[PDB]
Amino acid sequence: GGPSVFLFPPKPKDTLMISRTPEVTCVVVDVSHEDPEVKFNWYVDGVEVHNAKTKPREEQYNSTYRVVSVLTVLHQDWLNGKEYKCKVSNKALPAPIEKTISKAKGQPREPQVYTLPPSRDELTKNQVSLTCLVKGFYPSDIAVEWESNGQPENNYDTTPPVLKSDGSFFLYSDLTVDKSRWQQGNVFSCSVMHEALHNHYTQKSLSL
Amino acid sequence: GGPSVFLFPPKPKDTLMISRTPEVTCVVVDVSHEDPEVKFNWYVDGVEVHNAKTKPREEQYNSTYRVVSVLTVLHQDWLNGKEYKCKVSNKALPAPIEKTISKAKGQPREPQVYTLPPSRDELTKNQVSLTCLVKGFYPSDIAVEWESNGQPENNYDTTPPVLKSDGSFFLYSDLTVDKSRWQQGNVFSCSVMHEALHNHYTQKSLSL
Ligand SMILES: *[C@@H]1O[C@H](CO[C@H]2O[C@@H](C)[C@@H](O)[C@@H](O)[C@@H]2O)[C@@H](O[C@@H]2O[C@H](CO)[C@@H](O[C@@H]3O[C@H](CO[C@H]4O[C@H](CO)[C@@H](O)[C@H](O)[C@@H]4O[C@H]4O[C@H](CO)[C@@H](O[C@@H]5O[C@H](CO)[C@H](O)[C@H](O)[C@H]5O)[C@H](O)[C@H]4NC(C)=O)[C@@H](O)[C@H](O[C@@H]4O[C@H](CO)[C@@H](O)[C@H](O)[C@@H]4O[C@@H]4O[C@H](CO)[C@@H](O)[C@H](O)[C@H]4NC(C)=O)[C@@H]3O)[C@H](O)[C@H]2NC(C)=O)[C@H](O)[C@H]1NC(C)=O
Numbered sequence: 326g327g328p329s330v331f332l333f334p335p336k337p338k339d340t341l342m343i344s345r346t347p348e349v350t351c352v353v354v355d356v357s358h359e360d361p362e363v364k365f366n367w368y369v370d371g372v373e374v375h376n377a378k379t380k381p382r383e384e385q386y387n388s389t390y391r392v393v394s395v396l397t398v399l400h401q402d403w404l405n406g407k408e409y410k411c412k413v414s415n416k417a418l419p420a421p422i423e424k425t426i427s428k429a430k431g432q433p434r435e436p437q438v439y440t441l442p443p444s445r446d447e448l449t450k451n452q453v454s455l456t457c458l459v460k461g462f463y464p465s466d467i468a469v470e471w472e473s474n475g476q477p478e479n480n481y482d483t484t485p486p487v488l489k490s491d492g493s494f495f496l497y498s499d500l501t502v503d504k505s506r507w508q509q510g511n512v513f514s515c516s517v518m519h520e521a522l523h524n525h526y527t528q529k530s531l532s533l
Numbered sequence: 534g535g536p537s538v539f540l541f542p543p544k545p546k547d548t549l550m551i552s553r554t555p556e557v558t559c560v561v562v563d564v565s566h567e568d569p570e571v572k573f574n575w576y577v578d579g580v581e582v583h584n585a586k587t588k589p590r591e592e593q594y595n596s597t598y599r600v601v602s603v604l605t606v607l608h609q610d611w612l613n614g615k616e617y618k619c620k621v622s623n624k625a626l627p628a629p630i631e632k633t634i635s636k637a638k639g640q641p642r643e644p645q646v647y648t649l650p651p652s653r654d655e656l657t658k659n660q661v662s663l664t665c666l667v668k669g670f671y672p673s674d675i676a677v678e679w680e681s682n683g684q685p686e687n688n689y690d691t692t693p694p695v696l697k698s699d700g701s702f703f704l705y706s707d708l709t710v711d712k713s714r715w716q717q718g719n720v721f722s723c724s725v726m727h728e729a730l731h732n733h734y735t736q737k738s739l740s741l
């Protein structure tokens with residue numbers, strides 16, 4: 326009996342691209358159908374902010390409501406480790422609940438990006454696998470794409486980051502392409518977006 | 534206030550190997566220090582088998598004990614998809630708690646195993662990454678290890694399966710070894726165990 330608060334970070338790709346909207350999301354569950362009103366107060370670094378958008382209530386199968394408020398964050402402030410505080414208040418709730426999240430603490434470290442050509446054994450099939458290995462980056466927030474001839478490349482699949490024993494992360498991306506295109510020596514390119522890279526961006530090409 | 538039950542499947546290698554004993558493990562946490570008695574009832578496909586092993590209670594640091602009951606499963610009884618049930622009873626627990634797991638149904642599919650030598654740009658560091666790409670298998674249950682000269686290597690990290698859009702799974706394994714051992718021509722090997730492979734087993738050797 327009593328509302329509970331969970332505060333979630335922006336998505337990594339949203340934080341690293343100027344055209345997307347990173348946002349912190351304050352979720353409140355277990356709010357009574359009796360008292361269904363919640364008030365949110367948001368503090369960036371202490372300083373209160375007023376442009377947060379609240380969404381409408383939606384009742385769960387639990388017969389309790391879930392109410393959410395999302396706050397847009399400035400790319401830079403997130404990057405520079407500013408604290409985003411969510412205070413919630415409900416009348417079926419004795420004292421306000423506060424939560425604070427932020428960029429992952431710790432020394433950022435630059436990823437190494439390697440491109441691996443298809444295995445000789447895969448040079449059997451109509452389609453081959455182009456591999457991008459991204460290892461040794463901190464924090465785990467990152468974004469990987471593929472391109473060729475200045476155009477995006479659609480069917481790649483990327484693994485989630487995996488924490489290596491030294492405290493950094495690695496992942497792999499697999500872009501599968503028609504072997505006709507690979508055998509022509511067309512140049513494919515693995516794009517990596519990460520806070521620790523110069524201008525937050527690096528490319529690594531692959532062909533022969 | 535109140536116990537909780539979590540029920541986990543066997544280790545994928547244990548189900549695939551004639552010489553291993555897969556088990557289903559039913560864990561109970563948040564048990565009372567005043568009421569430490571828990572009884573288990575194990576339902577295979579409905580019918581009762583009574584051979585399950587109950588581990589003694591172990592006290593956690595949050596002052597609540599830890600009850601484990603494990604039941605060995607016959608290999609094809611899991612692989613054909615028969616459901617395993619763990620009902621848990623406790624005096625500080627009003628109505629019993631049931632849990633059920635089973636093999637993920639769907640037509641199994643043979644994993645492709647391709648091995649990729651180090652990137653050229655990594656042949657300058659003292660440590661090198663050997664890469665096993667395992668793609669196109671269903672379901673996600675799989676075991677991946679590494680050998681060299683027939684002897685197992687341990688310093689690797691495997692990603693968890695990732696779902697492709699066609700409905701299958703792929704992963705990568707990153708075996709790290711000193712380049713002195715790569716440039717000497719040692720024959721490294723990544724082993725993949727899966728129900729859809731012939732013999733539940735396959736290996737790919739890589740060197741030059
Ligand atoms: C009544 O039902 C409610 C839920 O509805 C249920 O309806 C019934 C009928 C069934 O169908 C249910 O299955 C159904 O869910 C219950 O609410 C739930 O409460 C529990 C606990 O009370 C919550 O569990 C927590 O879960 C979070 C993870 O949240 C994500 O979980 C799932 C996916 O797995 C998802 O459904 C959920 O919504 C969250 O996913 C998504 O959340 C955001 C959605 O807005 C996404 O944010 C994104 O933001 C970007 C911004 O750029 C973009 O905008 C994206 O579009 C946007 O979506 C987010 O990415 C997304 N993620 C995923 C994966 O989908 C856990 O993290 C919680 O953390 C733990 O908390 C406990 C303490 O309670 C600790 O023991 C843990 O260690 C951990 O907390 C640690 O300690 C402190 C906190 O104490 C932290 O500071 C530490 O950092 C923590 N440590 C670590 C290592 O993290 C927790 O487990 C559950 O989410 C609720 N369900 C919701 C909200 O839908 C009610 O409880 C229930 N009432 C009763 C009385 O039972």
Ligand SMILES: *[C@@H]1O[C@H](CO)[C@@H](O[C@@H]2O[C@H](CO)[C@@H](O[C@@H]3O[C@H](CO[C@H]4O[C@H](CO)[C@@H](O)[C@H](O)[C@@H]4O[C@H]4O[C@H](CO)[C@@H](O[C@@H]5O[C@H](CO)[C@H](O)[C@H](O)[C@H]5O)[C@H](O)[C@H]4NC(C)=O)[C@@H](O)[C@H](O[C@@H]4O[C@H](CO)[C@@H](O)[C@H](O)[C@@H]4O)[C@@H]3O)[C@H](O)[C@H]2NC(C)=O)[C@H](O)[C@H]1NC(C)=O
Pocket residue numbers: 537539541542543544547554555556557558560562563593594595597
């Ligand atoms: C006092 O402290 C205790 C412990 O400190 C608290 O208990 C914890 O409660 C948590 C929630 O109440 C519970 O979280 C749940 O976690 C599981 C994941 O389980 C693994 O989690 C840990 C690793 O990340 C590990 O410590 C666990 O033991 C589990 O790992 C292992 O489990 C089995 C152990 O026997 C293994 O089975 C293996 O079986 C083969 C058989 O062939 C073989 O025999 C092998 O040797 C066996 O070990 C697993 O393989 C092994 N796995 C690994 C990776 O090591 C999640 O899956 C749960 O599911 C979630 O439930 C949520 C709702 O409850 C839901 O929101 C979500 O979507 C998902 O469904 C859940 O998160 C935690 O596990 C538990 N700790 C335990 C049991 O040790 C206790 O709460 C606390 N008391 C108070 C009060 O705070």
